[model samples]
Target: SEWTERKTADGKTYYYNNRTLESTWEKPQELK
Candidate 1:
C-alpha cells in the first residue's frame, strides 16, 4: 500500500491514493 501527498502554502494537506488532478485545485488553492 502506498500514498501520495500534496501541500498548500496555507498549510492544507491532501492525500491521494490515485492520480490527482491539480487543474481543479489550481485556482482555489493554487497548489502544484
Candidate 2:
C-alpha cells in the first residue's frame, strides 16, 4: 500500500491513500 503524507490545520499529519476508491477511512489500532 502507498500512503501520502497529509497535514491538517490542527498540526496533525496523517497517511492518506489517494488511489483508493473506497468511501470510508480506517485508522490503525495504535492510533485508536
Candidate 3:
C-alpha cells in the first residue's frame, strides 16, 4: 500500500493510505 502525506485542520501531519483511505495513529478496531 502507498502511504501519502496529509495535513489536518489543526496543522498536524499524518500518513494516509491511498488504497484503503485510512489515517495514521490508530489501530484497526474492526477489520474487513
Best by lDDT: 3
Candidate 1 at 10: error in angstroms? 6.1
TM-score of each: 0.31, 0.33, 0.35
**Mind giving the per-residue lDDT tens digits that candidate 1 earns over 1-32?**
23445686867665554445332322333234
Among all candidates shown, the one with the greatest TM-score: 3
lDDT of candidate 2 over 1-32, digit per residue (tens): 35545677867666665556322234444332
RMSD of 2: 5.4
lDDT of 2: 0.50
Query: After TM-score superposition, what is the CA distance of residue 16 in candidate 1 from its true location, in Å?
Result: 0.7
Candidate 3: TM-score? Answer: 0.35
Candidate 3 residue lDDT tens string, 1-32: 35655567877777667566767644343423
Flag the better candidate by lDDT, 2 or 3. Answer: 3
Candidate lDDT scores, in order, read: 0.45, 0.50, 0.59
Worst 10 residues of 3 by lDDT: 23-32
TM-score, model 1 to reference: 0.31
Clashes of each: 0, 0, 0
